[PDB]
Amino acid sequence: MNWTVDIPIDPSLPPLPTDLRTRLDAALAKPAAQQPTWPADQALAMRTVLESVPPVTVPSEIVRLQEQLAQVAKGEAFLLQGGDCAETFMDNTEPHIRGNVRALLQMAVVLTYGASMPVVKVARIAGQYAKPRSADIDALGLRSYRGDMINGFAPDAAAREHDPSRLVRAYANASAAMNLVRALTSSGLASLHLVHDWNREFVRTSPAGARYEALATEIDRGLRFMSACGVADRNLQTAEIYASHEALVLDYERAMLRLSDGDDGEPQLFDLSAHTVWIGERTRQIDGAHIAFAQVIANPVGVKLGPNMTPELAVEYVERLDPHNKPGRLTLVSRMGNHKVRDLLPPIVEKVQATGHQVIWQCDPMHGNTHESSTGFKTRHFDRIVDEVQGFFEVHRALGTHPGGIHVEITGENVTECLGGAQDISETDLAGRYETACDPRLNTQQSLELAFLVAEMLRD
Amino acid sequence: MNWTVDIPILPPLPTDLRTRLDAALAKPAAQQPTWPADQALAMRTVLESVPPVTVPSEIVRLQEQLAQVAKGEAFLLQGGDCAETFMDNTEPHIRGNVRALLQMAVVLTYGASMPVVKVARIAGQYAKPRSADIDALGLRSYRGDMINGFAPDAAAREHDPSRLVRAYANASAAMNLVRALTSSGLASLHLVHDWNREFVRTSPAGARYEALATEIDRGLRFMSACGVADRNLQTAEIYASHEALVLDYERAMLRLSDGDDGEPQLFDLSAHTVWIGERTRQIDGAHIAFAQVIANPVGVKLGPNMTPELAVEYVERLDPHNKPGRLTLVSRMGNHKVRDLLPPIVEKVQATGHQVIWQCDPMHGNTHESSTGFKTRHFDRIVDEVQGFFEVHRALGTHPGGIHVEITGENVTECLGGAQDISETDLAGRYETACDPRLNTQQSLELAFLVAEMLRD
Amino acid sequence: MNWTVDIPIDPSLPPLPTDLRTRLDAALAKPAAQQPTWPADQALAMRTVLESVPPVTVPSEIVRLQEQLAQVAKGEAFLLQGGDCAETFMDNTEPHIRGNVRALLQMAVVLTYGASMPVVKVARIAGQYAKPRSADIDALGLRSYRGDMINGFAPDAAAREHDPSRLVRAYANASAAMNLVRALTSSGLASLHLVHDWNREFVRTSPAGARYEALATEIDRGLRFMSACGVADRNLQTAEIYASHEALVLDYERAMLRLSDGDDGEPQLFDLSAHTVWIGERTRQIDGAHIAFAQVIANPVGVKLGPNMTPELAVEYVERLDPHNKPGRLTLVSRMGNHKVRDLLPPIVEKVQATGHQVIWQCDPMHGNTHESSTGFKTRHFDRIVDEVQGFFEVHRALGTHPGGIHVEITGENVTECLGGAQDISETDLAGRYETACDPRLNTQQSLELAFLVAEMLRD
Amino acid sequence: MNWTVDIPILPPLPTDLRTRLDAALAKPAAQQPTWPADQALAMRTVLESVPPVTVPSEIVRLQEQLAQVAKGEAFLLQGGDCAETFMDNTEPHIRGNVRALLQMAVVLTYGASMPVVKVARIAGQYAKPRSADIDALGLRSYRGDMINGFAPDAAAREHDPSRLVRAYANASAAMNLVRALTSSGLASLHLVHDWNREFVRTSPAGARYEALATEIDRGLRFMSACGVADRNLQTAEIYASHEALVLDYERAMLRLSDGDDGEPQLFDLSAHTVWIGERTRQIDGAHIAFAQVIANPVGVKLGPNMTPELAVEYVERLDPHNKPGRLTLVSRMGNHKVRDLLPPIVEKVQATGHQVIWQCDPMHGNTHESSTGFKTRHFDRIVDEVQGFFEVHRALGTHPGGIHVEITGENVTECLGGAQDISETDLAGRYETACDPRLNTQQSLELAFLVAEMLRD
Ligand SMILES: N[C@@H](Cc1c[nH]c2ccccc12)C(=O)O
Ligand SMILES: N[C@@H](Cc1c[nH]c2ccccc12)C(=O)O
Ligand SMILES: N[C@@H](Cc1c[nH]c2ccccc12)C(=O)O
Ligand SMILES: N[C@@H](Cc1c[nH]c2ccccc12)C(=O)O
Ligand SMILES: N[C@@H](Cc1ccc(O)cc1)C(=O)O
Ligand SMILES: N[C@@H](Cc1ccc(O)cc1)C(=O)O
Ligand SMILES: N[C@@H](Cc1ccc(O)cc1)C(=O)O
Ligand SMILES: N[C@@H](Cc1ccc(O)cc1)C(=O)O
Ligand SMILES: N[C@@H](Cc1ccc(O)cc1)C(=O)O
Ligand SMILES: N[C@@H](Cc1ccc(O)cc1)C(=O)O
Ligand SMILES: [Cl-]
Ligand SMILES: [Cl-]
Ligand SMILES: [Cl-]
Ligand SMILES: [Cl-]
Ligand SMILES: [Mn+2]
Ligand SMILES: [Mn+2]
Ligand SMILES: [Mn+2]
Ligand SMILES: [Mn+2]
Incomplete structure (x- = not known):
């Protein structure tokens, strides 16, 4: 008579090493922004369960991504990151997951051709369950909705309580999602020829299909050249999609830390929640736990940069989070907004470039670009987004640095949470399918089209 | 504490699949947990939305490869905990069963001299049958974690349908991890073989086997020397399987996919392949007929009690389309009866012209009780059963198609015998099974060698 | 004191089988057009030497080409054949051979992309040493020069005598040439990336490089997409170039016949002078030895067709030379001329199509297109040639048949034996490098450019 | 009759290469044919235009791979007629030597457990040295077809520089054919192995070897079972080699190519690799210094007479840049002297820190004369020499790097011993060598097995 079902919880594995634990305990002491307010005794319970479950990724996989990213940081691959703004447990379904990966790969092929160079595919998925808040109380006068990792989307005070059982449901x-994403991609869903076939079907039918035919045709034909050529095609059957989410909830993040075998190398501390995680704009304080936390772990990390960023602060990131000068170890993600990315960005890049360190310069053109529409709904303009990428490019091309890649919020559903692009979404259209639990994201059409427009940036 | 999941508030079956499934599930169903329909239904509703553990493309893939084994051109290895447990479902235990299975796969690959299709008893082996309802302690029998708990107490043994979603x-999570594991370094042939070599050094019967182990090293080195030591060797495909025991479970994880033949059909996406057990195989039973509706390759355990004609009905029902490898028939007779009992069954089935995989479950036939109190197996008897399994087949020119064994990566002491000479006295030291005794790491591996030799003769 | 050097000649291998020899002896009895007039006793000597030397190709190689061609006849690959009009012993040098293969592969990549489908590469080489004659006496009043297989190019009666030692020098x-061609192509010379690099260098510098840049750029990028994609590239390191020549001198051709192992299949009679050979316009008489000869051997054969051809005669070819209906066993090569290929061709194709048999429809746009220039020199216009291909296409596209490929005369040298194309060769230019011993051929530039123009035909 | 070739009526060497080559060729040159300069020059002029038998890209390729053998990570096999002949240069003889060499390559590949670089004495082994000018019959000695004819008559033995262009x-033609052969079916591992199997059935000592032959079949089957039985196995690279005996020949086939290091250098494109012989190795001789100007990997035969210090000079001259595998040093001592003589030579050379390939020429040391009149070898002695060749190397931890043998595909009877027990009486039946006696098909193969075992210990 309560419409839910309580799943009961459980034999601890051996603790991490006293030496690393001291280094870790020392790190976590620093003030943590945006953490949830739930009781410590309870968190510790749930953390204890997490520390003994099978990890969503593994060290071999991540060191392997560190190498690929390395190659991006070196300007020889390009990085594509994308998926839901916020992942909601109710919607972590096979169809939704198929569609977001389908989307990511559809751009992947378009960006791959355009970039003329391998793309590294990272999904926002399998862990983007917590967000930062601005406001203590939301408009409905309720405690902020902080991501299903922390609380329910429903506007009922019960739903909103910070509930650390949610760490496990996370x-x-x-x-579940991870393991689908793997099966999907190891099976035919990331075939090049199929993913492309979806792309063709897009051109047949987008309003702006003209805009795209020419390039879509080159792609087909350069693909067909591959079989003309007889190059062994198995590598065309399967695509690697890594998993990323913002590391916000340190209890979950801390909970999932593990030591590597050490067989490949001396044992390191990694975060197995995900493959790479970033630190947001609100939690990035230098002297804070989140930056500290990113310091300890070997995963590739990223840090978001918005307008307040000062090249000197940039640098300090670089010296904190990439002390060893491992290229691609750290990514920095411009999110100025289109109007300011040209002015704001250049200095940063140069100050950072001067350092030594090679870092991925990745453009997030979504978080700088959000505005409320006359009709109620939070929104983003396809043009302003495109545009920021164009600016991001222009900044790097001018400075002779590498435009590492893009970070975007998209989905496979035909949502209407972003305005414009070929479908010409109108503020009224927005009511029809605003099914995002947070930031408005590029619909499967807007994502593709965006990747066409970015492909054209990459060939100039 | 506990975690709370919501009940949703979903594509219609083609009229026929609905009828056939329903007809299917109306028949009598043995060994089903006794929990309420409301609550079972509820659990089901959750599950009918979770992401599947496997996906169709893979099962078809597995089919193509089982056809290979069927036709005599590949060998099947199926191996795992006898009952996985939620408590033990950890990075180490998983990692080590995956390794134990892989290590036998390489020895087996080299002895077959054909590919071994590798199927783990993992990611859903949470449900057992029981023949007596009331346990030895007078407590309700443990049916495995998807139904109830091991802890020997009234409360714990009550059937908890919360267990379905927990399972x-x-x-x-295990699946995710096995996929992650087998596609990163854990399955590198080379890396796996090195593990085998360690085994030969430190085994007590290293010598017995070192020779064959050297011939594999030489095999494997040979590949490099021919400049073919490439991508294929860095990865292996491990398929998830379990007995399709709980119909509220399998029914929930069903999913409807299109067929390249172009009619839609139902796969059970709870595992790549599932098998009906000895106790659930009634021909007009819910399980057999369920097994007739799902696309998944199925297997059927076969008892000593089995008769050629029944086996044929099994074949004409599970395999009404004569697709090779749709149907495995797993013999378990014990070493003492396998020679007498199996052939006629082989001939009649063979006479039909369907090609099934004949697979040998050595473990299940051969169970016995210690005088120290523990349910156990003798390594010697297990080997003998696979032994005469082979002789039966050679003698008819039929294909000994693969083996089904219960093993673990842990150095357990649940089986007597092997190089170790695990003893009834010894069993009391690490006997961590939730259920049937497993070959530990040394014993599976050992049995792998001994089987490959059976393979070379 | 004679400026030459006589190389002495030699132990017979076992004869071919009495049964096949009877079939063969019976076949050769038919009148042979255009054979040389040298003494039979001598021919027999030289044939005896040929029958025991190592063959220039092997059966495995040829059955393997029969399959590829099959695929062309089925409209799924495209056939490219080209090299010298006439090969002269003096010029069978490593540089000249490099350049003609370099040329053939340069088109090969361009046609491959354009065709969107594998190309089968056959060189006119390693055997195109004999030609047919029109005229008993040439203008210089001398016995016709018939190819170095038969006699010397020099205008001295001594040179012109039909000398069957020449069979061996052939x-x-x-x-020598064959074995270079193999080494070259198994080594880096048929790397895709290198061959293409030569192609880029062509665009940088042809006058008409604009015309070509766009497509050259697609090619680069679709190539770069291959490495972006990570497809195993060894197949991109090496190209198979088969050898073809016209089978004119039956003594040489007969001399080189061998029986296969039979291990793959029942033993067949093949011609190991070459991989595939064609029968010319003058030697193709139906009741003649050349057609008979092509009947006996398993090699893929072709027959040239010019304006006099009547679809019924076409058919009889088809029923004679492809009795077993093995697709791609027989190729028929249109050489109407540009003005007539549109009118002349259609009926033939249809009459032949109606038969059952699948044959490669290959366009020779060179032999229909030759005219003498005001300045003395035999010549061909780049446009008329292009044009014939365009017509050949148009004929097939209209009939919904497959345009199998092209047969062309080209070289790697920057000769000026053909007028026009991007360099705008003028009749006066022609004196500068008319180094062909026969028909004027496309210079390395004209060949490429031709392949650009044909690539564009294939994408319509 | 005869065929007449014209004399032409061609890129200048960089001043240094011209000087160095000239300086090179001015030194004294032993064992050179005695024909006139005009005529030799003429022949040269022809040749300086013929298409090369090999090309640079390949020789560099061969170098990279010889470095592998040098470093201990690959094994070198070099095998052919002792002197090819124009008369025998036919599709069958070629096809069968290529096969005989390949068949040893597979047994050897599997025993080394590393790649065998396979180098044929083919496509130019037309020139021999002679120690006595006047032959046993009082006729001028036969120096091989590139110089003169076998036919035992005055006329035939006159040095005919027409032989250079004929050679x-x-x-x-052989090269063309070997390339054609090795890239079409003749070199399929599988196809080759099947040939080996036939050998084990019908050999008289099949048994002796059948075991090892089964372990290769199993090796080779293993590749398929791991799904790696791909493109690489359908082809093998056979490199042409011969002794660089005739300087009018090698000098003519020289060709100048660019170096990726970017300086131009001269390769001899008459073969992939060439070796100086025992009689032509004078340190200040034309051959050694020629061998110093060409880019090609070179090898140097080494006599019993050899001294550690000379061997070092050889290394410091042929290998002045310390590139591994630029230089092979081929021991031939006979079984009786190899153990005593070779080590010190190994140590001093090793002491230098250049890495050479140490290769064993078993045949040349061990020649002896029948009492039936025929020059012959005992299979037993040949094996023993490779034997102690290995012991020497194991004993120093140096790398036994490969072997150089004279074999043929023909069932000849030119060597005593082997499973066949070819006998002095027997030698008179098929003793078709133009020169040194060859291991026939059975004997090469046999020696391959026996060597691989030397390889497994
Ligand atoms: N695996 C390669 C090729 C590939 C397969 N499918 C793809 C889908 C999109 C982009 C690339 C691919 C990679 O990531 O490219
Ligand atoms: N991938 C092939 C070969 C292989 C890779 N890793 C392995 C591990 C064990 C046995 C075989 C393998 C297979 O699954 O057979
Ligand atoms: N071997 C393939 C690819 C290839 C390599 N080099 C080439 C040169 C031109 C055209 C194609 C190729 C083929 O014939 O294509
Ligand atoms: N191509 C590899 C493996 C191989 C192919 N064919 C062979 C013939 C013999 C021995 C080895 C091989 C090699 O040269 O080794
Ligand atoms: N996404 C769902 C369904 C689900 C339930 C349990 C899982 O383990 C995974 C998924 C939820 O939590 O409601
Ligand atoms: N799980 C449903 C069957 C079902 C499966 C897939 C569907 O798309 C629809 C229904 C059952 O138990 O009966
Ligand atoms: N196996 C433990 C921990 C766990 C929790 C949630 C999972 O998804 C997986 C494992 C349990 O079932 O409580
Ligand atoms: N092409 C030349 C050079 C040559 C000579 C002899 C050959 O075997 C090959 C080529 C000629 O005959 O003059
Ligand atoms: N063959 C010439 C040398 C040479 C080689 C190549 C050249 O490009 C020029 C000269 C000689 O005997 O001396
Ligand atoms: N070997 C024979 C036949 C032959 C002739 C010309 C060749 O190119 C090759 C071989 C000879 O030398 O006379
Ligand atoms: Cl805060
Ligand atoms: Cl570009
Ligand atoms: Cl005539
Ligand atoms: Cl197209
Ligand atoms: Mn967001
Ligand atoms: Mn069990
Ligand atoms: Mn012509
Ligand atoms: Mn010799």
């Missing part, structure tokens, strides 16, 4: 969800 | 939850 | 030459 | 002519 975990089961991310697993 | 799936542990299913995904 | 053989040594063809070997 | 190239036969060179190309």
